[PDB]
Design an enzyme around this catalytic site. Structure first.
Site, PDB file in Angstrom:
ATOM      1  N   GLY D   9      -3.541  -0.011  -3.132  1.00 53.10           N
ATOM      2  CA  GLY D   9      -2.237  -0.612  -3.339  1.00 53.10           C
ATOM      3  C   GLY D   9      -1.432   0.130  -4.384  1.00 53.10           C
ATOM      4  O   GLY D   9      -1.285  -0.346  -5.512  1.00 53.10           O
ATOM      5  N   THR D  10      -0.909   1.297  -4.029  1.00 49.62           N
ATOM      6  CA  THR D  10      -0.326   2.223  -4.985  1.00 49.62           C
ATOM      7  C   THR D  10       1.188   2.311  -4.804  1.00 49.62           C
ATOM      8  O   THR D  10       1.791   1.609  -3.990  1.00 49.62           O
ATOM      9  CB  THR D  10      -0.969   3.604  -4.836  1.00 49.62           C
ATOM     10  N   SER D  11       1.799   3.189  -5.597  1.00 54.07           N
ATOM     11  CA  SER D  11       3.201   3.561  -5.454  1.00 54.07           C
ATOM     12  C   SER D  11       3.281   5.080  -5.470  1.00 54.07           C
ATOM     13  O   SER D  11       2.977   5.707  -6.489  1.00 54.07           O
ATOM     14  CB  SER D  11       4.059   2.960  -6.572  1.00 54.07           C
ATOM     15  N   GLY D 137       3.115   3.215  -0.089  1.00 54.01           N
ATOM     16  CA  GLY D 137       2.371   2.246  -0.865  1.00 54.01           C
ATOM     17  C   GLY D 137       2.982   0.857  -0.791  1.00 54.01           C
ATOM     18  O   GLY D 137       4.063   0.637  -0.240  1.00 54.01           O
ATOM     19  N   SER D 138       2.253  -0.100  -1.371  1.00 52.31           N
ATOM     20  CA  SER D 138       2.716  -1.483  -1.378  1.00 52.31           C
ATOM     21  C   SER D 138       3.978  -1.651  -2.213  1.00 52.31           C
ATOM     22  O   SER D 138       4.823  -2.495  -1.896  1.00 52.31           O
ATOM     23  CB  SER D 138       1.610  -2.404  -1.891  1.00 52.31           C
TER      24      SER D 138
END
Lengths: 142, 209, 224, 205, 193, 210, 191, 250, 205, 209
Positions: D9-11, D137-138
């Protein structure tokens, strides 16, 4: 370029699929006595209720080897996978030890497993047809 | 060959009818664990060694399925010993990490082993966390087990870059002690292993009590 | 495969007196998110074939790879690979339909709907449809997805039977296609205002138009 | 996708600018609501000037990245420095051919003398798309508008750094799965430059 | 299908119900749930459809092959061990099937009768008496069994058990075929249970 | 799980005459309530004076017809261009259908032709190969409407044995017109293939398109 | 002997006449057609619901005659049946009803059918109810002709019932009603 | 070695799945070997649960349902003159017209008869295959095959596919010099039962009233079979002697 | 929440500015992927200067809004013009007391002489929050960052109009459930002003 | 009282064992429908009237459960007639919309009626769509039924603000015709009703045959 093995399920079945244990009285039917599986194992039962990881584990090394060969073909050309396959075929073909099951040293050198151990190495493993002559017949295809 | 799948259908038919920490310090790494071994709510053993030795200077501690943890650690240790003999060199933590990661990924998470691996090699000191499905991560301080939250709270309270050997040992001991006091899964003793660059590994059994 | 992730909506097509016209929008959606703008979904094969693909985008790119490899293998050692041994629309459709049915039978399908349009070497129009189940059919007007429910009724008013084909000019067919695309942009929530069009004519060859936009939109009666 | 598996769950951001490309990410890895690692490095190097960021299953993406790095070493032994397009093609083939068993998405940023900086995105499913900039990403969902309003072609290095910093700060602000420090890699003809920005800096933007 | 067996001082008595398949009316005069493994070892089996018959015929073929090859007869203990091994093997890769076998023999090296029972999972138990298929005959056996009972007393106990079984079954229960294994071999009691 | 089957509901009818056979079908191809096409033939000439139709899931029927025609090609190659009789074709189709016993084609198959004595013959197949020779059979969505019309018109009422080709064609057309009036899935067009000693002839008629 | 659920009902219109017929289990009393003066109702489906509906409609028609001082007409009875069926919106009877009759003042024949919650289908040619035979509808479609005389209409409906019975045997029978403006004839068919 | 090179020399064929010999044979690409297999090849879906797939997709609108054999009463019994087989001949009705009488008894060869129950296609296909096997056996051994051997062949065949979806119940009846007259019953569960009197289908209890003795004449046996079928309820009669089966019809 | 029920996949904004408040929305109502109505008016008036926008179940929100309008008429018959806080409280009570049976979310924008323009948001569940500006709907997720970077207190009317137009244009661009025209209501001391903007205008921003 | 719930458990135990358009024009509204009535794939009636009259100048056409549509329309018509008698005024379309909306919302979607309602009252011309769960919407042109997509395509092709009565009638007829040709649910005929301000309603049965 596969990682997890694919296309593991069988698409066709027949009563004579296992050519090595075909009955001599009825060549279209298998010989249950020489199968030595307990006598109550129809082939259909092998098509259902299998552990989902069994096919992945049984074909893992072959899949990795095929991916390596495909990479060699893409980067080096046809000759490199051709030579690797030829070497492996030559080594596997001339080894015939009916009293042993361990692999050869040269095969491990070719597979780059000289100093590698897996559970297949730790755990490598009748009334009818478990003798030298059965292995001779299977090896020679007679 | 390999692990067997026999009696899988039969077993289906019959069915139908811990605190671990790792801390880096300026010249090495430390791993620590508790000694309580339980079988459900019953305390099976009050003095159990949970720190395992992959290689003389590479140690690990695991959680999950105990048999899987032990078996995977021993298999990787055998591979590491053979590789070190083959290359005539001291084993590296990165190599053990690679072997563990690929072996765990091969079995698609069906081998329930979660590991903290610490070690010292000619390239330096290393600390890693390893998940059952094959993912790995690096860190300066790690916790694992049912008491990992309390230990991580203690580690976040008293961790800094310039840590001596004694400070690191005290911090790891305090984290394990917090897991001992506040978690029903831990509680008996604290085992420590200190791996310092250029020296032999030091295994301290029952460091606290 | 076994689930679509990035998808395109619909492709529409019709026959006129001297050729065929096909069109499709340039959007790749990610569910309710209109993620990728600038996805080309009309693939020109040879100088006489256009393939329109709706559905899974990754499978669409796989099909594009297959079509390019087919062109390359046809070329190979053939001297007259572009004069008299060039690929026909019927050959391409037969290969694609065989692939689609075979992958359906493997329980490993390609989640796409495909329309092949073009002109045969004898001047005959070719327009046929296949989908992920291997179902194939032909009609003077074809459409996939939402278009099949809204574009086909509009296009059948221009070309309703075979005898209507000789009576339909390129201008009328192109206008009908443009109006159908405007209606789709009105009533399809996964559609885009940007679309590409392709005309295949037995006289003028292949004309590929990109960066076409829906125009003359009646957003005026919403004031009251 | 697998039960009890570590997700990403990254950016993730990658922006092409005048002198090259910049790849940026946060540093948070979580298990449900618990933060398993707050200083994780998400910028994966597969070649000296070819880097990537990963989404989906952590184990699957790590295995794919290792295979890609091995493939690029084999390619370099033969023909020298590979192009970003070749690495993107290898990533795409690995992701697409195994999409029924592995969950993986990859953003690839590269530099080479011929193409002068490129960005590719391979979302779930295995399709490939070449873009002037990409987000994933999320936490990307919360910055779709802002980026669309603030990206320009041929920006300078400092402007690109500021754009990425602002976008990732907003993504961290609104996404619970994103946080920590902002890590960036700048790939140009001069070399590889690593940058890090701390919460007390970007939270005041 | 119900099977019973009693080991008396000098012999083994095995009783098997001469039942037919359900849904088809059959007239016959044969015991289809019993195979002679060796001239001094008999096996009775009960369970589901043709899986059990396939297993019994496979066992019989193997034992006949051994007897021909060695010009010698396996003891009942060895026969039971081989059957247990084969039954355990047959379900190592498939869903288990309902099967229960009683093996009765007369060992001539030891000159004594022996009786064994193997269930569907491959559990072999040596018992003085046993039964399968009954939903209590165990108490009747316990109260009226002695190790040194003669063949006649064992037959009387078997008749009492048969009457107790038939008092709670419909008339569709045609009867039970009884066989005796002793030092003279295997014989069939054509008179009555 | 992915569903590999579909439905393209149509109607077919085979009738055996004294020295001729007819196989007819509606040309409507539909999906749910939508119309895929208004002229998509489902009755094919397979060579050697044999007409075939496989109604149901269209992809499976197309595959079955393709396989049968390729097998006929190899039969001509391997047996000195011998003519394939209708009973041999029925046996081949039975084997082709039963080869998919555990993954069957979702079709109902009718073939028609002339037997060895020159009489008309029609064979009907179940989805997994069970087949029989019949004088008349209707299959598909509107069979329960077409069959009573023929039963009222003909006696199996002038006997079927003395009917000509034109009278049979008229009866088929009238029955299909009635079914089109009553059934939503029937309409657009009707195509009839007639097999006689001179070969195969095709006729087409229009039906209501609503 | 106690299994009477199901059955078929056929209603047809001729010239100044109607016909309503139902199947019957005979061999070795339970009819599915009832009348309320000059309106005939045939009910297929669950037998207990058929009996309940017949009793309820007898109740309501008796009260209607007592109040209005006149017999109820087919259209009014159709509306009453529809409303009564809709009353049980969430617990509906498992029935298919058919109504036939002749309006006294106008002389126009009338037939209608209902769904289980009272939706009215007014047909000018014929109504078929029941699921015993799917080809019964096709046979009725092939045999029916508009504006038939009572004898011709009786022959047509009897032939349809006989062919349907032959399609699906011992003990089967039929009851047929031919209704005119002033004469009602009830006949039994043992074939 | 060059074969290895060809294996590694190049996509389209792989997508067509025509690199496998079985696929080429099934589509008659390389010849008609598909129609030359003594043991038929049966296609299965390449998934983890083929049995569940088939069971779900078979137990559900058009006429494309698998045809089921008649549940009518069938009787077989044996006497000193041979075997009497009687089948209640009452064909069902559908949207078709029969060209001739429909046979519920399969003529395996001029000496063997089988009875249909359950799946019609399974019975027909596998009894024709059994006839082929018996013909090959008789050619090889230069002697007529015994009924026990043929029944065992069919039983082994159906047992190899047990649980896959096959549904069949048959009675194999034959008169040989060595065995006399013999009747076996074989079903898809693998059961193989030798018998003297068999009654299968609805009304089997009424037909089991067979007045039976091993001294009945041919006419008496035929009359008894006809009467038993009528009590169960036209009747089709077969009389099997050492010289073959004779069809009477009644 | 109910099976086969009409949902509200909208884009809703409400912004407080120097002279009052502005409420803006798109005009798209969809059933799955089909657009059932492309010119729907989503600006609901419950009092002369108290307006709202609705999310969740359409029937439940319509019933709640009708009850609120009736309640405010009853209140006006007694004490005159109600405050925005009172209307927000009534909305909150109706949403919270029926949250187990109805799915409803409401954004309320109001003006009065005492408080001079207020915005309240009642998300699913029934809690109430007072904010200087609020966004809601399926398309709001894509403009969380942009709004956070572009909102200022005490903006002029034109600046607020531009901010809302840009934000809703981005929301329409990225959300498939949002589209059509942009409708706004401006509530100040001068009165009520209705505004509409067409796709050919805001798509070129 | 009201709709009964009796035999609900019994029925559970036993179980265990069209194109419609509305178009506004400059001085009124038009509603149109097809005349095909089917029971499954069988055409039950080729001439069925689907346009219903709530009040002399308020008409509607429905889809879904036919009995529910008819019953709800009749109940609202009775309420409208009583209200008009009580107020001594011409009924308004808004009042019928309010009654329908509240009645449908009371039953929580269990009454499966989907309606298009057109009408003319002293306030003007009105056109509304009504969903089973109680939501309502306004529009200038609306479509409903299984053939609603083709009809909506035609309406989007040829609709404009300045429409005369004849143009509106032709447009509605064309939309119904498209639904007739391209949808298996429609096909027989076209029924029209035109409601013009200041005049009587005009009901054209089988306008197109």
């Amino acid at each position: 370029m596969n990682i997890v093995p694919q296309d593991t399920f069988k698409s066709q079945v027949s009563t004579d699929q296992d050519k090595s244990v075909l009955s001599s009285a009825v060549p279209s039917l298998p010989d249950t006595l020489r199968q030595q599986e307990g006598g109550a194992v129809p082939l259909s039962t092998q098509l259902n209720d299998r552990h989902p990881l069994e096919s992945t584990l049984k074909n893992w090394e072959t899949t990795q080897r095929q991916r390596q060969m495909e990479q060699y073909r893409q980067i080096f050309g046809i000759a490199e996978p051709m030579k690797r396959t030829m070497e492996m075929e030559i080594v596997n073909r001339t080894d015939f030890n009916p009293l042993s099951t361990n692999g050869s040293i040269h095969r491990d050198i070719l597979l780059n497993k000289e100093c590698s151990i897996d559970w297949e190495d730790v755990y490598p493993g009748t009334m009818v047809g478990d003798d030298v002559h059965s292995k001779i017949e299977k090896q020679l295809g007679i | 060959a390999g692990l067997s799948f026999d009696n899988y259908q039969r077993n289906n038919f019959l069915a139908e009818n811990t605190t671990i920490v790792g801390v880096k310090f300026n010249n090495g790494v430390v791993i620590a664990a508790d000694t309580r071994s339980t079988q459900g709510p019953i305390v099976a053993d009050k003095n159990c060694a949970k720190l395992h030795r992959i290689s003389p200077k590479i140690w690990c501690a695991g959680a999950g399925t105990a048999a899987d943890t032990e078996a995977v650690t021993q298999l990787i240790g055998s591979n590491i010993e053979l590789h070190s003999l083959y290359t005539s060199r001291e084993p590296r933590v990165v190599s053990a990490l690679q072997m563990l990661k690929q072996h765990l990924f091969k079995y698609q998470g069906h081998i329930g082993a979660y590991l903290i691996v610490a070690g010292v090699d000619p390239t330096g000191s290393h600390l890693f966390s390893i998940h059952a499905h094959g993912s790995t991560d690096v860190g300066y301080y790690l916790s694992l087990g049912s008491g990992s939250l309390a230990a991580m709270a203690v580690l976040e309270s008293h961790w800094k870059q310039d840590l001596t050997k004694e400070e690191a040992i005290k911090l790891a001991s305090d984290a394990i002690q917090a897991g001992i006091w506040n978690d029903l899964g831990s509680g008996s003793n604290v085992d420590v292993c200190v791996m310092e660059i250029g020296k032999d590994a030091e295994y301290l059994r029952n460091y606290l009590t | 495969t076994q689930q679509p992730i990035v998808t395109g909506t619909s492709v529409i097509s019709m026959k006129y007196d001297n050729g065929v016209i096909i069109a499709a929008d340039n959007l790749g959606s990610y569910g309710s998110l209109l993620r990728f703008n600038g996805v080309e979904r009309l693939i020109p094969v040879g100088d006489n074939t256009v393939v329109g693909i709706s559905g899974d985008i990754s499978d669409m790119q796989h099909i594009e790879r297959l079509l390019k490899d087919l062109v390359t293998e046809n070329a190979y050692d053939n001297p007259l690979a572009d004069a008299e041994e060039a690929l026909e629309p019927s050959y391409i459709f037969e290969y694609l339909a065989t692939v689609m049915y075979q992958r359906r039978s493997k329980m490993n399908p390609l989640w796409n709907a495909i329309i092949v349009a073009g002109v045969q070497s004898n001047g005959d129009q070719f327009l046929r449809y296949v989908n992920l189940l291997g179902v194939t059919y032909s009609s003077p007007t074809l459409a996939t997805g939402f278009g099949a429910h809204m574009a086909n009724p509009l296009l059948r008013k221009v070309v309703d039977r075979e005898s209507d084909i000789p009576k339909t000019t390129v201008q009328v067919a192109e206008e009908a296609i443009v109006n159908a695309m405007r209606v789709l942009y009105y009533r399809d929530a996964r559609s885009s205002r940007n679309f590409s069009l392709a005309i295949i004519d037995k006289n003028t060859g292949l004309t590929f138009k990109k960066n076409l936009q829906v125009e003359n939109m009646k957003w005026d009666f919403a004031k009251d | 996708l697998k039960k009890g598996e570590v997700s990403l769950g990254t950016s993730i951001m990658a922006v092409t600018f005048k002198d090259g490309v910049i790849l940026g990410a946060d540093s948070r890895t979580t298990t449900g609501a618990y933060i398993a690692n707050r200083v994780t490095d998400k910028l994966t190097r597969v070649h000296d000037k070819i880097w990537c960021c990963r989404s989906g299953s952590a184990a699957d993406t790590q295995a794919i990245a290792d295979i890609v790095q091995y493939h690029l070493e084999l390619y370099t032994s033969q023909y020298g420095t590979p192009s970003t397009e070749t690495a993107a093609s290898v990533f795409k083939e690995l992701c697409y051919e195994n999409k029924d068993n592995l969950t993986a998405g990859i953003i690839v940023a590269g530099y080479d003398d011929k193409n002068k900086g490129e960005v590719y995105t391979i979302p779930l499913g295995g399709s490939v798309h070449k873009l002037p900039y990409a987000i994933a990403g999320s936490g990307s969902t919360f910055i779709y508008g802002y980026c669309d309003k603030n990206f320009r072609e041929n920006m300078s290095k400092e402007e690109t750094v500021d754009f990425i910093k602002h976008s990732l700060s907003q993504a961290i602000k609104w996404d619970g799965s994103s946080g920590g420090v902002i890590r960036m890699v700048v790939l140009t003809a001069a070399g590889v430059e690593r940058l890090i920005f701390y919460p007390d800096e970007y939270e005041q933007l | 299908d119900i099977i019973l067996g009693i080991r008396v001082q000098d012999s083994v008595i095995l009783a098997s119900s001469k039942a037919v398949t359900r849904g088809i009316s059959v007239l016959k005069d044969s015991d289809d749930k019993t195979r002679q493994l060796s001239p001094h070892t008999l096996m009775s089996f009960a369970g589901e459809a043709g899986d059990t018959v396939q297993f019994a015929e496979y066992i019989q073929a193997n034992i006949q092959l051994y007897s021909i090859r060695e010009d010698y007869e396996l003891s009942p203990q060895a026969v039971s061990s081989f059957v247990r091994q084969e039954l355990a093997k047959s379900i190592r890769s498939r869903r288990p099937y309902q099967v229960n076998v009683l093996i009765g023999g007369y060992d001539k090296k030891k000159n004594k009768p022996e009786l064994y029972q193997i269930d569907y999972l491959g559990t072999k138990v040596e018992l003085p008496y046993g039964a399968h298929g009954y939903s209590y005959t165990f108490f009747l056996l316990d109260h009226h069994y002695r190790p040194d009972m003669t063949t006649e007393e064992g037959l009387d106990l078997l008749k009492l058990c048969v009457q107790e079984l038939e008092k709670r079954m419909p008339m569709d229960f045609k009867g039970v075929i009884v066989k005796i294994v002793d030092k003279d071999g295997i014989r069939q009691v054509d008179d009555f249970q | 799980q992915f569903n590999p089957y579909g439905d393209n509901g149509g109607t077919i009818l085979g009738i055996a005459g004294e020295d001729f056979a007819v196989l007819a079908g509606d040309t409507r191809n539909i999906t749910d309530y939508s119309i895929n096409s208004r002229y998509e033939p489902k009755v094919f000439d397979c060579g050697d004076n044999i007409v075939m139709s496989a109604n149901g899931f269209a992809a499976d029927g197309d595959a079955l017809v393709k396989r049968f025609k390729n097998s006929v090609k190899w039969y001509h190659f391997d047996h000195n261009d011998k003519k394939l009789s209708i009973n041999s074709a029925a046996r081949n189709i039975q084997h082709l259908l039963y080869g998919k016993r555990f993954f069957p084609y979702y079709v109902h198959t009718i073939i028609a032709g002339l037997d060895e004595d020159g009489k008309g013959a029609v064979y009907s197949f179940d989805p997994v190969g069970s087949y029989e020779r019949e004088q008349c059979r209707a299959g598909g969505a509107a069979a329960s409407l077409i069959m009573p019309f023929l039963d009222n018109q003909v006696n199996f009422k002038k006997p079927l044995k003395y009917l000509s080709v034109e009278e049979v064609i008229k009866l088929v057309r009238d029955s299909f017109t009635s079914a089109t009036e009553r059934h939503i899935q029937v309409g657009d067009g009707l195509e009839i293939l007639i097999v006689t000693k001179d070969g195969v002839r095709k006729e087409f008629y229009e039906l209501k398109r609503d | 002997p106690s299994s009477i659920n199901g059955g078929i009902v056929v209603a047809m219109t001729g010239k100044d006449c109607v016909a309503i017929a139902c199947d019957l289990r005979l061999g070795s009393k339970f009819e599915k057609i009832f009348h309320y003066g000059h309106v005939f109702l045939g009910i297929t489906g669950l037998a207990t619901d058929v009996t309940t509906l017949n009793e309820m409609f007898r109740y309501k028609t008796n009260l209607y005659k007592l109040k209005e001082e006149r017999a109820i007409e087919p259209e009014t009875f159709t509306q009453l049946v529809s409303s009564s069926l809709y009353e049980r919106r969430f617990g509906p009877y498992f029935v298919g009803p058919v109504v036939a009759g002749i309006n006294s003042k106008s002389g126009k024949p009338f037939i209608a059918g209902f769904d289980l919650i009272g939706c009215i289908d007014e047909a000018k040619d014929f109504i078929v109810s029941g699921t015993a035979s799917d080809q019964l509808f096709g046979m009725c479609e092939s045999l029916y002709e508009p504006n038939l005389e009572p004898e011709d209409l009786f022959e047509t409906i009897s032939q349809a019932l006989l062919n349907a019975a032959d399609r699906d045997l011992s003990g089967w029978g039929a009851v047929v009603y031919i209704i005119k403006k002033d004469e009602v004839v009830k006949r039994y068919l043992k074939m | 070695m060059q074969a290895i090179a060809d294996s590694f020399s190049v996509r389209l064929v792989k997508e067509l799945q025509y690199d496998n010999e079985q696929n080429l044979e099934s589509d008659f690409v390389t010849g008609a070997s598909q129609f030359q297999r003594l043991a038929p090849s049966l296609t299965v879906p390449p998934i983890a649960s083929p049995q569940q797939f088939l069971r779900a997709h078979t137990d559900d609108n058009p006429d494309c349902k698998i045809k089921i054999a008649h549940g009518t009463t069938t009787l077989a019994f044996r006497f000193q003159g041979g075997i009497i087989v009687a089948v209640d001949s009452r064909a069902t009705a559908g949207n078709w017209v029969a060209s001739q009488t429909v046979k519920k008894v399969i003529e395996i060869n001029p000496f063997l008869l089988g009875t249909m129950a359950g799946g019609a296609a399974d019975c027909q296909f596998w009894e024709t295959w059994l006839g082929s096997q018996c013909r090959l056996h008789e050619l090889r051994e230069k002697e007529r095959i015994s009924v026990a051997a043929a029944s065992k062949i069919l039983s082994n065949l159906v047992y190899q596919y047990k649980g896959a979806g096959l549904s069949m119940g048959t009675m194999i009846c034959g008169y040989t010099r060595k065995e006399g007259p013999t009747i076996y019953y074989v079903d898809s569960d693998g059961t193989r039962l030798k018998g003297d009197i068999f009654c299968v289908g609805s009304g089997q209890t009424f037909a089991y009233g067979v007045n039976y003795k091993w001294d009945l004449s041919v006419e008496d046996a035929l009359y008894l079979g006809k009467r038993s079928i009528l009590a169960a309820a036209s009747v089709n009669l077969y009389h099997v002697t050492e010289d073959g089966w004779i069809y009477h019809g009644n």
